[PDB]
Design a protein around this nucleic acid. Structure first.
Lengths: 59, 175, 747
RNA sequence: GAACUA
């Protein structure tokens, strides 16, 4: 990157998750997709960007 | 059982360069140190902790595997604030044995901890001894680990980029 | 290398029960055994013990040739017999699983079936299986056999290789990743997950090993290591499928807790005719619900970043709520509302994370729960205010490094010898010389503990432990006269039921504040009779908890709910009962143990939770105060007796949800966790003391710990947990917790 | 307690 734009990062924005999180997020998506589970009508409408902001996985 | 098929004897690939300077040993520390390590070593080193990570979070994950006689969080000598290295002392050596196997590689605070064996915790090594009172690892690191402050003190110092939410341990006498 | 026949037998004892589960080829090591089973693990995770060929010449020596126990596991009778019969059948070999388990069961009795029964025998002091293997599909009984073998293998592997997480994970991976058939892998994975979970819960229920290691956290870490090793093996059958199974099982248990019956949710909503859907065979017990919502799921979520199908799980659970009970077949069967379940899960999770982290992942449908789980400080009570503001000034002036017991004694005896209720107390219908000192020193001890709690705020374990050890001689010195003795000479309640003139004089003139447990139960008893006990004996932490307003209560709805206490009070009570009482129970006298200070006793912890669980109406000061107190307790006794009579008349095998409930222990999970942790800590400390070299201080410590265990049993019976209604049956009637403690087999 | 190597 080599970017000089550096400011305060709070604490919940400086969490980078291990590479294994791709497995577990795929597992959550698979368990929700099959077995017929749907989110709340109202969490689905966080398509206007208010939904959970989930931490980045490394690599 | 598997503790009879794998040699889980306490070991330290690490050598405190300051306890080797003393005793004047040419890497002879292992010959003498191993004793206090195999028997009576209940101290486990904690590594890769965010300056944000707090002792209660450390206490809970360790408490699961054993009761903690002493919980110590490393303090930068200059700031008396966490260096991201922690020392945990257990009443039971088996609890220390439990901690190294169970907690190695676990996320104590959304980060990969590295639990090791230590011969014992005195009140000297509890202070980071690198450049800016932190750990030597911090100066020589060439990466962006924001939870450890950002770039290493030596790469940050020259490039030119640089707290309050950190816990100031003012109940610990200054070194 | 050149193992002796003694060394060979032990190697065989640990690693010969596992060979039947792979398809004893005999005369082959575990690596070539796996090579003939499709090589489930790569040549990177193979261990050294897996490469040790079986012996020659020695084999006729070993045939001629009880078995030593293990370092840190309470082994089962079935496991000891199966691992001993496998050495007998490994050397005689120098199909196989069925004969091994059949012989092991026959050994136990003489001083599908044959594998389900083997699992039950292992997980018993019999165990009711939590998850059923019958729901697999149709026209395939092979899958049921594979799943049952996997469950047994997981139980035995946790029993033997449990203390080495990587070895157990590798063995379980080797079992699961056999190349028998594509549909067999799913059954093995489901069996392994079920076995690990059930074995952890059963171990924490009915197994004492004296090590202080939580089986549930180890189970969670083992499952996450299994997924990680699957991913590494996947890098070149998918870790995604294993994690999917792990989640599906956890969600099935969660929905069984919420629904209250075997809803068979995963069988109904199902993808296709070829899959394994986890299905609970019975409702969950209170202990299992506590395990899941307090230790297991929080640990698993911590590893997975507290991420989860939160919205989907919450939406489905609330739909499970609407049902009226379809059936209540199981006596020890608990049903909880969705809000209560997720509140408990998130308050257990919130201890290991920060509000922002949870709120970031939690969707907007959790806003009500999050706000209910997220006056949070310890403030000096008015009773200890002016005599504690001097001690706090001293503590701030020096700090935990500089605080000394000798100086604290003088600072405390100066700030608590000039104020009213102290200069008005040495003035004295007539108090004996022993009576007045047993009051003054009680007040000094209470002031010191309140000052310590306010100063430290119980936010850092290190400072709390330092100051408790440092001021531990002073606490023991001040508590020596009080100790276990009623502070007043005689019971404060005399039967119209009124109070002794001494108690009324103190409370209404000298303004001495007793905590509402030395006189409230014994007044409820008098009111019941109208139509010394352990809790009456002094406990310093009971008084301190009363003065800080640590009132823990159940919900208006019932067991269905749970914690009805405020979030601030719940957090303060957790910090208190975990970092001041339990952590100080048998803590080392010095830092850097086998040597401990008697500042906190087991009876102290139990009495403090009984005090915190009293009705808030009776644990609140009026606005003569003594008379209002008593009226209030009389009216409460009348109401509670009416409720008890109604419940008894309505009840005529009886389910625990139909019994009378005080909503004290079954509603607050902190109570149950603390009471269990008291005995677990006592046993672990006793193990550490025994392991130390014999002497005199060790013998004294052992005697003290045995007396602590006996006193813990006595105090539990004194509060109605271990059995016209009594006062204890009206204040602390907890059928679920009493059932667990009676059938746990530890009392 | 990454002192090689900064």
């Amino acid at each position: 990157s080599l970017s000089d734009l550096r400011q305060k990062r709070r604490r919940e924005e400086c969490v980078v998750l291990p590479p294994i999180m791709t497995v577990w997020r795929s597992a959550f998506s698979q368990y929700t997709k099959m077995w017929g589970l749907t989110k709340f009508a109202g969490d689905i409408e966080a398509e206007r960007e208010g939904e959970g902001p989930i931490l980045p996985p490394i690599r | 059982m598997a503790e009879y098929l794998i040699d889980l004897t306490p070991r330290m690939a690490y050598v405190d360069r300051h306890e080797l300077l003393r005793s004047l040993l040419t890497e002879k520390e292992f010959i003498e140190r191993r004793q206090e390590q195999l028997n009576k070593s209940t101290t486990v080193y904690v590594g890769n902790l965010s300056f944000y990570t707090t002792e209660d979070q450390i206490w809970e994950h360790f408490s699961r595997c054993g009761h903690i006689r002493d919980l110590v969080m490393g303090l930068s000598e200059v700031t008396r604030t966490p260096c991201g290295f922690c020392f945990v002392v257990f009443e039971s050596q088996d609890g220390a044995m439990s901690a190294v196997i169970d907690l190695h590689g676990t996320l104590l605070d959304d980060r990969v901890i590295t639990v090791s064996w230590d011969v014992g915790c005195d009140h000297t090594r509890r202070w980071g001894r690198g450049a800016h009172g932190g750990q030597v690892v911090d100066g020589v690191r060439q990466n962006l680990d924001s939870a450890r402050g950002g770039l290493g003190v030596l790469r940050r110092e020259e490039l030119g980029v640089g707290e309050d939410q950190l816990v100031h341990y003012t109940w610990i006498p200054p070194r | 290398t050149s193992y002796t026949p003694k060394q060979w037998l032990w190697f065989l004892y640990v690693t010969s029960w596992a060979r039947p589960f792979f398809t004893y080829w005999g005369r082959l090591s575990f690596d070539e055994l796996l090579k003939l089973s499709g090589s489930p693990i790569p040549p990177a995770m193979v261990s050294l013990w897996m490469g040790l060929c079986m012996p020659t010449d020695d084999v006729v020596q070993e045939l001629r040739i009880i078995y030593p126990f293990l370092p840190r596991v309470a082994e089962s009778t079935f496991g000891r017999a199966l691992r001993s019969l496998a050495v007998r059948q490994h050397i005689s070999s120098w199909a196989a699983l069925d004969v091994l388990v059949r012989d092991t069961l026959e050994v136990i009795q003489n001083s599908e079936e044959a594998l389900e029964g083997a699992f039950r025998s292992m997980l018993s002091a019999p165990l009711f299986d939590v998850k059923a293997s019958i729901p697999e599909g149709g026209t395939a009984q092979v899958l049921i056999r594979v799943a049952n073998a996997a469950r047994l293998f997981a139980a035995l592997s946790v029993e033997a290789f449990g203390r080495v997480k990587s070895e157990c994970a590798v063995l379980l991976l080797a079992h699961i990743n056999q190349r028998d058939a594509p549909e067999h892998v799913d059954a093995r994975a489901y069996g392994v997950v079920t076995g690990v979970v059930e074995y952890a819960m059963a171990y924490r229920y009915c197994r004492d090993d004296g090590t202080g290691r939580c089986p549930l956290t180890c189970a969670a870490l083992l499952l996450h290591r299994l997924v990680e090793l699957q991913g590494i093996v996947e890098k070149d059958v998918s870790a995604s499928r294993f994690a999917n199974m792990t989640v599906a099982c956890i969600q099935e248990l969660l929905f069984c807790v919420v629904a209250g019956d075997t809803v068979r949710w995963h069988r109904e909503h199902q993808p296709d005719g070829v899959s394994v859907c986890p299905t609970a065979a019975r409702t969950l017990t209170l202990h299992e619900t506590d395990c899941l919502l307090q230790v297991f799921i929080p640990a698993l979520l911590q590893q997975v970043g507290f991420e989860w199908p939160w919205s989907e799980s919450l939406r489905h659970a609330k739909m499970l709520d609407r049902a009226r009970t379809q059936h209540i077949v199981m006596e020890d069967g608990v049903r909880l509302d969705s809000r209560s379940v997720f509140e408990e899960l998130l308050v257990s999770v919130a201890r290991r994370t920060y509000g922002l982290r949870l709120r970031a992942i939690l969707p907007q449908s959790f806003d009500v729960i999050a706000e209910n789980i997220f006056s949070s400080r310890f403030a000096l009570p008015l009773y200890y205010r002016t005599a504690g503001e001097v001690l706090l000034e001293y503590f701030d002036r020096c700090g935990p490094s500089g605080i000394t017991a000798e100086e604290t004694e003088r600072v405390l005896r100066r700030a608590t010898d000039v104020q009213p209720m102290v200069v008005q107390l040495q003035a004295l219908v007539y108090f004996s010389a022993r009576e007045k000192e047993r009051l003054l020193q009680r007040y000094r001890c209470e002031v010191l503990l309140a000052s310590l709690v306010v100063y430290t705020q119980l936010r850092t374990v290190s400072v709390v432990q330092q100051l408790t050890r440092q001021l531990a001689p002073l606490f023991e010195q001040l508590l020596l006269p009080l100790a276990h003795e009623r502070t007043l000479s005689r019971c404060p309640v005399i039967a119209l039921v009124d109070l002794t003139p001494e108690f009324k004089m103190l409370v209404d003139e000298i303004h001495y504040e007793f905590y509402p447990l030395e006189w409230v139960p014994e007044a409820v008893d008098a009111h019941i009779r109208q139509e010394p006990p352990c809790f009456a004996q002094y406990s310093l932490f009971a008084a301190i908890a009363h003065q800080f307003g640590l009132v823990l209560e159940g919900n208006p709805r019932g067991f269905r709910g749970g914690d009805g206490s405020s979030s601030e009070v719940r957090t303060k009570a957790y910090r208190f009962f975990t970092l001041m009482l339990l952590n100080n129970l048998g803590d080392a006298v010095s830092s850097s143990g086998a040597s401990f200070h008697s500042v906190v006793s087991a009876c102290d912890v139990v009495v403090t939770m009984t005090q915190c669980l009293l009705p808030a109406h009776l644990s609140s000061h009026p606005r003569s105060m003594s008379n209002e107190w008593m009226r209030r307790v009389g009216e409460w006794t009348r109401s509670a007796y009416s409720k008890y009579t109604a419940y008894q008349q309505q009840v005529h095998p009886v389910p625990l949800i139909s019994l009378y409930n005080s909503l004290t222990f079954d509603s607050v999970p902190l109570a149950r966790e603390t009471i269990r942790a008291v005995r677990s800590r006592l046993l672990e400390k006793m193990s550490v003391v025994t392991a130390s070299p014999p002497g005199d201080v060790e013998t004294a410590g052992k005697q003290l710990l045995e007396q602590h265990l006996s006193s813990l049993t006595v105090t539990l019976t004194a509060v109605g947990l271990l059995p016209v209604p009594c006062a204890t049956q009206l204040l602390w009637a907890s059928p679920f917790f009493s059932h667990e403690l009676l059938h746990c087999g530890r009392y």
